[PDB]
PDB file of N, CA and C in Angstrom:
ATOM      1  N   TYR A 349      17.017 -64.101 -13.651  1.00  0.00           N
ATOM      2  CA  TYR A 349      17.724 -63.229 -12.722  1.00  0.00           C
ATOM      3  C   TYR A 349      16.803 -62.191 -12.089  1.00  0.00           C
ATOM      4  N   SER A 350      15.650 -61.919 -12.707  1.00  0.00           N
ATOM      5  CA  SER A 350      14.718 -60.932 -12.164  1.00  0.00           C
ATOM      6  C   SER A 350      14.164 -61.375 -10.814  1.00  0.00           C
ATOM      7  N   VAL A 351      13.771 -62.646 -10.702  1.00  0.00           N
ATOM      8  CA  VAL A 351      13.298 -63.154  -9.419  1.00  0.00           C
ATOM      9  C   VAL A 351      14.462 -63.328  -8.446  1.00  0.00           C
ATOM     10  N   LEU A 352      15.654 -63.659  -8.954  1.00  0.00           N
ATOM     11  CA  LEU A 352      16.820 -63.811  -8.089  1.00  0.00           C
ATOM     12  C   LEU A 352      17.250 -62.476  -7.492  1.00  0.00           C
ATOM     13  N   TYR A 353      16.893 -61.365  -8.143  1.00  0.00           N
ATOM     14  CA  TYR A 353      17.233 -60.048  -7.613  1.00  0.00           C
ATOM     15  C   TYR A 353      16.513 -59.747  -6.305  1.00  0.00           C
ATOM     16  N   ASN A 354      15.336 -60.335  -6.079  1.00  0.00           N
ATOM     17  CA  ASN A 354      14.561 -60.019  -4.887  1.00  0.00           C
ATOM     18  C   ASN A 354      14.107 -61.229  -4.079  1.00  0.00           C
ATOM     19  N   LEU A 355      14.567 -62.444  -4.398  1.00  0.00           N
ATOM     20  CA  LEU A 355      14.337 -63.549  -3.470  1.00  0.00           C
ATOM     21  C   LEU A 355      15.147 -63.393  -2.189  1.00  0.00           C
ATOM     22  N   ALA A 356      16.358 -62.856  -2.282  1.00  0.00           N
ATOM     23  CA  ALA A 356      17.246 -62.731  -1.139  1.00  0.00           C
ATOM     24  C   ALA A 356      17.786 -61.313  -1.045  1.00  0.00           C
ATOM     25  N   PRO A 357      18.071 -60.824   0.185  1.00  0.00           N
ATOM     26  CA  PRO A 357      18.685 -59.502   0.365  1.00  0.00           C
ATOM     27  C   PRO A 357      20.203 -59.513   0.190  1.00  0.00           C
ATOM     28  N   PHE A 358      20.658 -60.012  -0.955  1.00  0.00           N
ATOM     29  CA  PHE A 358      22.079 -60.107  -1.242  1.00  0.00           C
ATOM     30  C   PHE A 358      22.633 -58.752  -1.675  1.00  0.00           C
ATOM     31  N   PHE A 359      23.961 -58.640  -1.629  1.00  0.00           N
ATOM     32  CA  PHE A 359      24.628 -57.393  -1.978  1.00  0.00           C
ATOM     33  C   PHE A 359      24.454 -57.091  -3.461  1.00  0.00           C
ATOM     34  N   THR A 360      24.111 -55.841  -3.771  1.00  0.00           N
ATOM     35  CA  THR A 360      23.696 -55.465  -5.118  1.00  0.00           C
ATOM     36  C   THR A 360      24.853 -55.416  -6.119  1.00  0.00           C
ATOM     37  N   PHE A 361      25.369 -56.600  -6.461  1.00  0.00           N
ATOM     38  CA  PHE A 361      26.332 -56.812  -7.544  1.00  0.00           C
ATOM     39  C   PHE A 361      27.618 -56.008  -7.315  1.00  0.00           C
ATOM     40  N   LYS A 362      28.318 -56.386  -6.252  1.00  0.00           N
ATOM     41  CA  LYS A 362      29.633 -55.821  -5.945  1.00  0.00           C
ATOM     42  C   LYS A 362      30.751 -56.649  -6.572  1.00  0.00           C
ATOM     43  N   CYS A 363      30.654 -56.900  -7.876  1.00  0.00           N
ATOM     44  CA  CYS A 363      31.613 -57.760  -8.551  1.00  0.00           C
ATOM     45  C   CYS A 363      31.859 -57.248  -9.963  1.00  0.00           C
ATOM     46  N   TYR A 364      33.022 -57.602 -10.505  1.00  0.00           N
ATOM     47  CA  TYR A 364      33.435 -57.184 -11.837  1.00  0.00           C
ATOM     48  C   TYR A 364      33.197 -58.299 -12.848  1.00  0.00           C
ATOM     49  N   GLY A 365      32.817 -57.906 -14.064  1.00  0.00           N
ATOM     50  CA  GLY A 365      32.575 -58.873 -15.117  1.00  0.00           C
ATOM     51  C   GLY A 365      31.372 -58.559 -15.982  1.00  0.00           C
ATOM     52  N   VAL A 366      30.412 -59.487 -16.000  1.00  0.00           N
ATOM     53  CA  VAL A 366      29.195 -59.322 -16.782  1.00  0.00           C
ATOM     54  C   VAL A 366      28.421 -58.094 -16.291  1.00  0.00           C
ATOM     55  N   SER A 367      27.704 -57.444 -17.210  1.00  0.00           N
ATOM     56  CA  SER A 367      26.889 -56.292 -16.858  1.00  0.00           C
ATOM     57  C   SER A 367      25.792 -56.691 -15.869  1.00  0.00           C
ATOM     58  N   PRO A 368      25.480 -55.817 -14.897  1.00  0.00           N
ATOM     59  CA  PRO A 368      24.518 -56.182 -13.843  1.00  0.00           C
ATOM     60  C   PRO A 368      23.102 -56.424 -14.345  1.00  0.00           C
ATOM     61  N   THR A 369      22.532 -55.447 -15.051  1.00  0.00           N
ATOM     62  CA  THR A 369      21.141 -55.523 -15.479  1.00  0.00           C
ATOM     63  C   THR A 369      20.959 -56.217 -16.822  1.00  0.00           C
ATOM     64  N   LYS A 370      22.042 -56.585 -17.498  1.00  0.00           N
ATOM     65  CA  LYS A 370      21.963 -57.229 -18.801  1.00  0.00           C
ATOM     66  C   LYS A 370      21.945 -58.749 -18.718  1.00  0.00           C
ATOM     67  N   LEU A 371      21.960 -59.318 -17.507  1.00  0.00           N
ATOM     68  CA  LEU A 371      22.104 -60.762 -17.329  1.00  0.00           C
ATOM     69  C   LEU A 371      20.968 -61.562 -17.955  1.00  0.00           C
ATOM     70  N   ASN A 372      19.822 -60.934 -18.216  1.00  0.00           N
ATOM     71  CA  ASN A 372      18.734 -61.612 -18.906  1.00  0.00           C
ATOM     72  C   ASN A 372      18.934 -61.662 -20.416  1.00  0.00           C
ATOM     73  N   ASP A 373      19.968 -61.008 -20.946  1.00  0.00           N
ATOM     74  CA  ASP A 373      20.126 -60.837 -22.385  1.00  0.00           C
ATOM     75  C   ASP A 373      21.341 -61.559 -22.961  1.00  0.00           C
ATOM     76  N   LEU A 374      22.128 -62.251 -22.141  1.00  0.00           N
ATOM     77  CA  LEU A 374      23.247 -63.031 -22.650  1.00  0.00           C
ATOM     78  C   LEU A 374      22.844 -64.487 -22.842  1.00  0.00           C
ATOM     79  N   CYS A 375      23.701 -65.227 -23.548  1.00  0.00           N
ATOM     80  CA  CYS A 375      23.464 -66.628 -23.866  1.00  0.00           C
ATOM     81  C   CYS A 375      24.586 -67.526 -23.355  1.00  0.00           C
ATOM     82  N   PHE A 376      24.991 -67.338 -22.098  1.00  0.00           N
ATOM     83  CA  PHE A 376      26.112 -68.075 -21.529  1.00  0.00           C
ATOM     84  C   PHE A 376      25.766 -69.546 -21.329  1.00  0.00           C
ATOM     85  N   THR A 377      26.793 -70.350 -21.057  1.00  0.00           N
ATOM     86  CA  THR A 377      26.633 -71.782 -20.844  1.00  0.00           C
ATOM     87  C   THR A 377      27.743 -72.286 -19.932  1.00  0.00           C
ATOM     88  N   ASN A 378      27.573 -73.529 -19.468  1.00  0.00           N
ATOM     89  CA  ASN A 378      28.537 -74.242 -18.632  1.00  0.00           C
ATOM     90  C   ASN A 378      28.846 -73.464 -17.356  1.00  0.00           C
ATOM     91  N   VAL A 379      27.840 -73.281 -16.507  1.00  0.00           N
ATOM     92  CA  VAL A 379      27.988 -72.511 -15.283  1.00  0.00           C
ATOM     93  C   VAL A 379      28.438 -73.431 -14.156  1.00  0.00           C
ATOM     94  N   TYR A 380      29.056 -72.826 -13.144  1.00  0.00           N
ATOM     95  CA  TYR A 380      29.499 -73.530 -11.949  1.00  0.00           C
ATOM     96  C   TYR A 380      28.934 -72.824 -10.727  1.00  0.00           C
ATOM     97  N   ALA A 381      28.274 -73.585  -9.857  1.00  0.00           N
ATOM     98  CA  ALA A 381      27.644 -73.049  -8.651  1.00  0.00           C
ATOM     99  C   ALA A 381      28.324 -73.675  -7.437  1.00  0.00           C
ATOM    100  N   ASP A 382      29.280 -72.955  -6.860  1.00  0.00           N
ATOM    101  CA  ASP A 382      29.986 -73.388  -5.661  1.00  0.00           C
ATOM    102  C   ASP A 382      29.618 -72.465  -4.509  1.00  0.00           C
ATOM    103  N   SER A 383      29.157 -73.050  -3.407  1.00  0.00           N
ATOM    104  CA  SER A 383      28.692 -72.296  -2.253  1.00  0.00           C
ATOM    105  C   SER A 383      29.515 -72.658  -1.024  1.00  0.00           C
ATOM    106  N   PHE A 384      29.858 -71.639  -0.239  1.00  0.00           N
ATOM    107  CA  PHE A 384      30.613 -71.820   0.992  1.00  0.00           C
ATOM    108  C   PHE A 384      30.330 -70.630   1.899  1.00  0.00           C
ATOM    109  N   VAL A 385      30.655 -70.793   3.179  1.00  0.00           N
ATOM    110  CA  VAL A 385      30.453 -69.751   4.180  1.00  0.00           C
ATOM    111  C   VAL A 385      31.806 -69.364   4.767  1.00  0.00           C
ATOM    112  N   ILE A 386      32.031 -68.059   4.905  1.00  0.00           N
ATOM    113  CA  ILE A 386      33.278 -67.508   5.409  1.00  0.00           C
ATOM    114  C   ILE A 386      32.959 -66.533   6.539  1.00  0.00           C
ATOM    115  N   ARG A 387      34.004 -65.898   7.070  1.00  0.00           N
ATOM    116  CA  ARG A 387      33.897 -65.054   8.256  1.00  0.00           C
ATOM    117  C   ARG A 387      34.319 -63.631   7.914  1.00  0.00           C
ATOM    118  N   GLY A 388      33.343 -62.729   7.836  1.00  0.00           N
ATOM    119  CA  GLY A 388      33.601 -61.302   7.775  1.00  0.00           C
ATOM    120  C   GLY A 388      34.311 -60.796   6.539  1.00  0.00           C
ATOM    121  N   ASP A 389      35.513 -60.255   6.732  1.00  0.00           N
ATOM    122  CA  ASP A 389      36.255 -59.546   5.696  1.00  0.00           C
ATOM    123  C   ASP A 389      37.012 -60.469   4.743  1.00  0.00           C
ATOM    124  N   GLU A 390      36.628 -61.738   4.640  1.00  0.00           N
ATOM    125  CA  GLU A 390      37.225 -62.639   3.662  1.00  0.00           C
ATOM    126  C   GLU A 390      36.540 -62.584   2.300  1.00  0.00           C
ATOM    127  N   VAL A 391      35.484 -61.779   2.151  1.00  0.00           N
ATOM    128  CA  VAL A 391      34.833 -61.627   0.852  1.00  0.00           C
ATOM    129  C   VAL A 391      35.754 -60.916  -0.130  1.00  0.00           C
ATOM    130  N   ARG A 392      36.488 -59.907   0.344  1.00  0.00           N
ATOM    131  CA  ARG A 392      37.432 -59.198  -0.513  1.00  0.00           C
ATOM    132  C   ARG A 392      38.579 -60.097  -0.959  1.00  0.00           C
ATOM    133  N   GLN A 393      38.888 -61.141  -0.183  1.00  0.00           N
ATOM    134  CA  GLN A 393      39.899 -62.107  -0.601  1.00  0.00           C
ATOM    135  C   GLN A 393      39.449 -62.902  -1.822  1.00  0.00           C
ATOM    136  N   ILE A 394      38.144 -63.128  -1.970  1.00  0.00           N
ATOM    137  CA  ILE A 394      37.621 -63.842  -3.129  1.00  0.00           C
ATOM    138  C   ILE A 394      37.486 -62.865  -4.289  1.00  0.00           C
ATOM    139  N   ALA A 395      38.539 -62.754  -5.096  1.00  0.00           N
ATOM    140  CA  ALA A 395      38.554 -61.855  -6.241  1.00  0.00           C
ATOM    141  C   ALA A 395      39.585 -62.372  -7.230  1.00  0.00           C
ATOM    142  N   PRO A 396      39.441 -62.061  -8.528  1.00  0.00           N
ATOM    143  CA  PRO A 396      40.453 -62.496  -9.502  1.00  0.00           C
ATOM    144  C   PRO A 396      41.808 -61.851  -9.261  1.00  0.00           C
ATOM    145  N   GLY A 397      42.792 -62.663  -8.878  1.00  0.00           N
ATOM    146  CA  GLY A 397      44.127 -62.179  -8.605  1.00  0.00           C
ATOM    147  C   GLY A 397      44.378 -61.727  -7.183  1.00  0.00           C
TER     148      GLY A 397
ATOM    149  N   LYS B 944      43.159 -60.528 -41.820  1.00  0.00           N
ATOM    150  CA  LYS B 944      43.538 -61.280 -40.630  1.00  0.00           C
ATOM    151  C   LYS B 944      43.713 -60.404 -39.396  1.00  0.00           C
ATOM    152  N   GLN B 945      43.935 -59.097 -39.569  1.00  0.00           N
ATOM    153  CA  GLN B 945      44.072 -58.214 -38.415  1.00  0.00           C
ATOM    154  C   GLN B 945      42.770 -58.060 -37.640  1.00  0.00           C
ATOM    155  N   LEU B 946      41.624 -58.327 -38.270  1.00  0.00           N
ATOM    156  CA  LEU B 946      40.354 -58.286 -37.555  1.00  0.00           C
ATOM    157  C   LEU B 946      40.207 -59.441 -36.574  1.00  0.00           C
ATOM    158  N   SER B 947      40.928 -60.544 -36.792  1.00  0.00           N
ATOM    159  CA  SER B 947      40.868 -61.682 -35.885  1.00  0.00           C
ATOM    160  C   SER B 947      41.622 -61.442 -34.584  1.00  0.00           C
ATOM    161  N   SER B 948      42.531 -60.471 -34.558  1.00  0.00           N
ATOM    162  CA  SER B 948      43.304 -60.197 -33.355  1.00  0.00           C
ATOM    163  C   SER B 948      42.434 -59.536 -32.292  1.00  0.00           C
ATOM    164  N   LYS B 949      42.825 -59.723 -31.033  1.00  0.00           N
ATOM    165  CA  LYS B 949      42.093 -59.164 -29.905  1.00  0.00           C
ATOM    166  C   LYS B 949      42.672 -57.850 -29.402  1.00  0.00           C
ATOM    167  N   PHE B 950      43.969 -57.614 -29.628  1.00  0.00           N
ATOM    168  CA  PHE B 950      44.668 -56.402 -29.184  1.00  0.00           C
ATOM    169  C   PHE B 950      44.543 -56.201 -27.675  1.00  0.00           C
ATOM    170  N   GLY B 951      44.620 -57.298 -26.925  1.00  0.00           N
ATOM    171  CA  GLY B 951      44.512 -57.254 -25.483  1.00  0.00           C
ATOM    172  C   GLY B 951      43.104 -57.300 -24.934  1.00  0.00           C
ATOM    173  N   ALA B 952      42.087 -57.283 -25.792  1.00  0.00           N
ATOM    174  CA  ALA B 952      40.710 -57.354 -25.331  1.00  0.00           C
ATOM    175  C   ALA B 952      40.304 -58.804 -25.081  1.00  0.00           C
ATOM    176  N   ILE B 953      39.110 -58.975 -24.509  1.00  0.00           N
ATOM    177  CA  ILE B 953      38.625 -60.313 -24.191  1.00  0.00           C
ATOM    178  C   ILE B 953      37.942 -60.982 -25.377  1.00  0.00           C
ATOM    179  N   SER B 954      37.586 -60.224 -26.413  1.00  0.00           N
ATOM    180  CA  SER B 954      36.921 -60.791 -27.575  1.00  0.00           C
ATOM    181  C   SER B 954      37.244 -59.949 -28.801  1.00  0.00           C
ATOM    182  N   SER B 955      37.149 -60.582 -29.968  1.00  0.00           N
ATOM    183  CA  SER B 955      37.389 -59.917 -31.240  1.00  0.00           C
ATOM    184  C   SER B 955      36.114 -59.396 -31.888  1.00  0.00           C
ATOM    185  N   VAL B 956      34.958 -59.606 -31.263  1.00  0.00           N
ATOM    186  CA  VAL B 956      33.677 -59.137 -31.779  1.00  0.00           C
ATOM    187  C   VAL B 956      33.205 -57.998 -30.886  1.00  0.00           C
ATOM    188  N   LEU B 957      32.969 -56.832 -31.492  1.00  0.00           N
ATOM    189  CA  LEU B 957      32.583 -55.657 -30.717  1.00  0.00           C
ATOM    190  C   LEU B 957      31.153 -55.761 -30.206  1.00  0.00           C
ATOM    191  N   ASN B 958      30.293 -56.494 -30.920  1.00  0.00           N
ATOM    192  CA  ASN B 958      28.934 -56.721 -30.439  1.00  0.00           C
ATOM    193  C   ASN B 958      28.938 -57.539 -29.154  1.00  0.00           C
ATOM    194  N   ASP B 959      29.846 -58.514 -29.056  1.00  0.00           N
ATOM    195  CA  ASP B 959      29.990 -59.280 -27.822  1.00  0.00           C
ATOM    196  C   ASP B 959      30.443 -58.391 -26.671  1.00  0.00           C
ATOM    197  N   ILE B 960      31.349 -57.448 -26.947  1.00  0.00           N
ATOM    198  CA  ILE B 960      31.790 -56.507 -25.921  1.00  0.00           C
ATOM    199  C   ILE B 960      30.634 -55.622 -25.473  1.00  0.00           C
ATOM    200  N   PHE B 961      29.821 -55.155 -26.425  1.00  0.00           N
ATOM    201  CA  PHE B 961      28.711 -54.271 -26.081  1.00  0.00           C
ATOM    202  C   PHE B 961      27.604 -55.001 -25.330  1.00  0.00           C
ATOM    203  N   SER B 962      27.367 -56.274 -25.644  1.00  0.00           N
ATOM    204  CA  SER B 962      26.294 -57.039 -25.022  1.00  0.00           C
ATOM    205  C   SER B 962      26.785 -57.956 -23.908  1.00  0.00           C
ATOM    206  N   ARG B 963      28.048 -57.839 -23.503  1.00  0.00           N
ATOM    207  CA  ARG B 963      28.595 -58.726 -22.483  1.00  0.00           C
ATOM    208  C   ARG B 963      29.195 -57.952 -21.316  1.00  0.00           C
ATOM    209  N   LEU B 964      29.798 -56.801 -21.596  1.00  0.00           N
ATOM    210  CA  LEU B 964      30.577 -56.070 -20.608  1.00  0.00           C
ATOM    211  C   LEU B 964      29.969 -54.690 -20.383  1.00  0.00           C
ATOM    212  N   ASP B 965      30.186 -54.156 -19.180  1.00  0.00           N
ATOM    213  CA  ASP B 965      29.540 -52.917 -18.765  1.00  0.00           C
ATOM    214  C   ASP B 965      30.045 -51.737 -19.598  1.00  0.00           C
ATOM    215  N   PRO B 966      29.150 -50.853 -20.038  1.00  0.00           N
ATOM    216  CA  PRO B 966      29.534 -49.760 -20.962  1.00  0.00           C
ATOM    217  C   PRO B 966      30.590 -48.808 -20.408  1.00  0.00           C
ATOM    218  N   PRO B 967      30.621 -48.490 -19.093  1.00  0.00           N
ATOM    219  CA  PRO B 967      31.748 -47.665 -18.607  1.00  0.00           C
ATOM    220  C   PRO B 967      33.125 -48.266 -18.854  1.00  0.00           C
ATOM    221  N   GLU B 968      33.273 -49.584 -18.741  1.00  0.00           N
ATOM    222  CA  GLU B 968      34.535 -50.228 -19.083  1.00  0.00           C
ATOM    223  C   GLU B 968      34.568 -50.713 -20.527  1.00  0.00           C
ATOM    224  N   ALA B 969      33.402 -50.937 -21.137  1.00  0.00           N
ATOM    225  CA  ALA B 969      33.371 -51.226 -22.565  1.00  0.00           C
ATOM    226  C   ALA B 969      33.857 -50.034 -23.375  1.00  0.00           C
ATOM    227  N   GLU B 970      33.761 -48.824 -22.819  1.00  0.00           N
ATOM    228  CA  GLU B 970      34.308 -47.648 -23.491  1.00  0.00           C
ATOM    229  C   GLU B 970      35.823 -47.749 -23.640  1.00  0.00           C
ATOM    230  N   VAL B 971      36.530 -48.118 -22.569  1.00  0.00           N
ATOM    231  CA  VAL B 971      37.982 -48.225 -22.693  1.00  0.00           C
ATOM    232  C   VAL B 971      38.365 -49.484 -23.470  1.00  0.00           C
ATOM    233  N   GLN B 972      37.553 -50.546 -23.388  1.00  0.00           N
ATOM    234  CA  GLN B 972      37.818 -51.736 -24.198  1.00  0.00           C
ATOM    235  C   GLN B 972      37.704 -51.426 -25.690  1.00  0.00           C
ATOM    236  N   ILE B 973      36.635 -50.731 -26.087  1.00  0.00           N
ATOM    237  CA  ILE B 973      36.484 -50.362 -27.488  1.00  0.00           C
ATOM    238  C   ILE B 973      37.520 -49.316 -27.878  1.00  0.00           C
ATOM    239  N   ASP B 974      37.964 -48.474 -26.938  1.00  0.00           N
ATOM    240  CA  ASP B 974      39.040 -47.539 -27.249  1.00  0.00           C
ATOM    241  C   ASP B 974      40.322 -48.281 -27.602  1.00  0.00           C
ATOM    242  N   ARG B 975      40.654 -49.317 -26.826  1.00  0.00           N
ATOM    243  CA  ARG B 975      41.818 -50.143 -27.141  1.00  0.00           C
ATOM    244  C   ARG B 975      41.651 -50.847 -28.485  1.00  0.00           C
ATOM    245  N   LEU B 976      40.453 -51.375 -28.754  1.00  0.00           N
ATOM    246  CA  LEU B 976      40.212 -52.067 -30.021  1.00  0.00           C
ATOM    247  C   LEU B 976      40.364 -51.126 -31.214  1.00  0.00           C
ATOM    248  N   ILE B 977      39.755 -49.938 -31.131  1.00  0.00           N
ATOM    249  CA  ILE B 977      39.807 -48.993 -32.242  1.00  0.00           C
ATOM    250  C   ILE B 977      41.222 -48.467 -32.432  1.00  0.00           C
ATOM    251  N   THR B 978      41.960 -48.220 -31.341  1.00  0.00           N
ATOM    252  CA  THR B 978      43.319 -47.719 -31.523  1.00  0.00           C
ATOM    253  C   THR B 978      44.253 -48.800 -32.067  1.00  0.00           C
ATOM    254  N   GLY B 979      44.027 -50.071 -31.719  1.00  0.00           N
ATOM    255  CA  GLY B 979      44.813 -51.135 -32.326  1.00  0.00           C
ATOM    256  C   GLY B 979      44.535 -51.285 -33.811  1.00  0.00           C
ATOM    257  N   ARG B 980      43.251 -51.262 -34.187  1.00  0.00           N
ATOM    258  CA  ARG B 980      42.911 -51.348 -35.605  1.00  0.00           C
ATOM    259  C   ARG B 980      43.369 -50.110 -36.367  1.00  0.00           C
ATOM    260  N   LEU B 981      43.377 -48.945 -35.714  1.00  0.00           N
ATOM    261  CA  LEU B 981      43.873 -47.731 -36.351  1.00  0.00           C
ATOM    262  C   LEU B 981      45.380 -47.795 -36.561  1.00  0.00           C
ATOM    263  N   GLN B 982      46.118 -48.353 -35.597  1.00  0.00           N
ATOM    264  CA  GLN B 982      47.553 -48.548 -35.787  1.00  0.00           C
ATOM    265  C   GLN B 982      47.829 -49.513 -36.934  1.00  0.00           C
ATOM    266  N   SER B 983      47.046 -50.593 -37.022  1.00  0.00           N
ATOM    267  CA  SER B 983      47.196 -51.526 -38.137  1.00  0.00           C
ATOM    268  C   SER B 983      46.896 -50.851 -39.473  1.00  0.00           C
ATOM    269  N   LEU B 984      45.845 -50.027 -39.517  1.00  0.00           N
ATOM    270  CA  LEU B 984      45.499 -49.318 -40.746  1.00  0.00           C
ATOM    271  C   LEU B 984      46.573 -48.304 -41.127  1.00  0.00           C
ATOM    272  N   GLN B 985      47.148 -47.612 -40.139  1.00  0.00           N
ATOM    273  CA  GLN B 985      48.237 -46.678 -40.414  1.00  0.00           C
ATOM    274  C   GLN B 985      49.456 -47.403 -40.969  1.00  0.00           C
ATOM    275  N   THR B 986      49.781 -48.571 -40.407  1.00  0.00           N
ATOM    276  CA  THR B 986      50.897 -49.358 -40.924  1.00  0.00           C
ATOM    277  C   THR B 986      50.640 -49.801 -42.360  1.00  0.00           C
ATOM    278  N   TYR B 987      49.418 -50.267 -42.642  1.00  0.00           N
ATOM    279  CA  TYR B 987      49.069 -50.674 -44.000  1.00  0.00           C
ATOM    280  C   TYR B 987      49.148 -49.501 -44.969  1.00  0.00           C
ATOM    281  N   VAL B 988      48.694 -48.322 -44.540  1.00  0.00           N
ATOM    282  CA  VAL B 988      48.699 -47.154 -45.414  1.00  0.00           C
ATOM    283  C   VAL B 988      50.126 -46.683 -45.680  1.00  0.00           C
ATOM    284  N   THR B 989      51.000 -46.744 -44.670  1.00  0.00           N
ATOM    285  CA  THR B 989      52.402 -46.393 -44.896  1.00  0.00           C
ATOM    286  C   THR B 989      53.071 -47.374 -45.856  1.00  0.00           C
ATOM    287  N   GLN B 990      52.781 -48.672 -45.706  1.00  0.00           N
ATOM    288  CA  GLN B 990      53.312 -49.659 -46.644  1.00  0.00           C
ATOM    289  C   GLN B 990      52.798 -49.407 -48.057  1.00  0.00           C
ATOM    290  N   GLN B 991      51.513 -49.067 -48.183  1.00  0.00           N
ATOM    291  CA  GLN B 991      50.940 -48.764 -49.491  1.00  0.00           C
ATOM    292  C   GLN B 991      51.559 -47.511 -50.093  1.00  0.00           C
ATOM    293  N   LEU B 992      51.856 -46.511 -49.263  1.00  0.00           N
ATOM    294  CA  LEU B 992      52.500 -45.297 -49.757  1.00  0.00           C
ATOM    295  C   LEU B 992      53.904 -45.586 -50.270  1.00  0.00           C
TER     296      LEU B 992
END
């Protein structure tokens, strides 16, 4: 995640859940990587609930 | 067996909460955990009395 923090100018962790800077210290498994493109203010629509 | 309960939290292990979730919200998560276990201990102590 250290290189992923500065490969792209993405938004600095505007999401709820896992700790931001602790991502190198967990032992998670079974990840899902789904990518799509949306228009403008639909990012807030993508949230739990 | 009361230690196995979650009391509304996401996990029954406090180390997982500390190493998985952000400390500003881990504070209220551990507050819920400690108050649930304290209620269980109070119930046990009243029964023992």
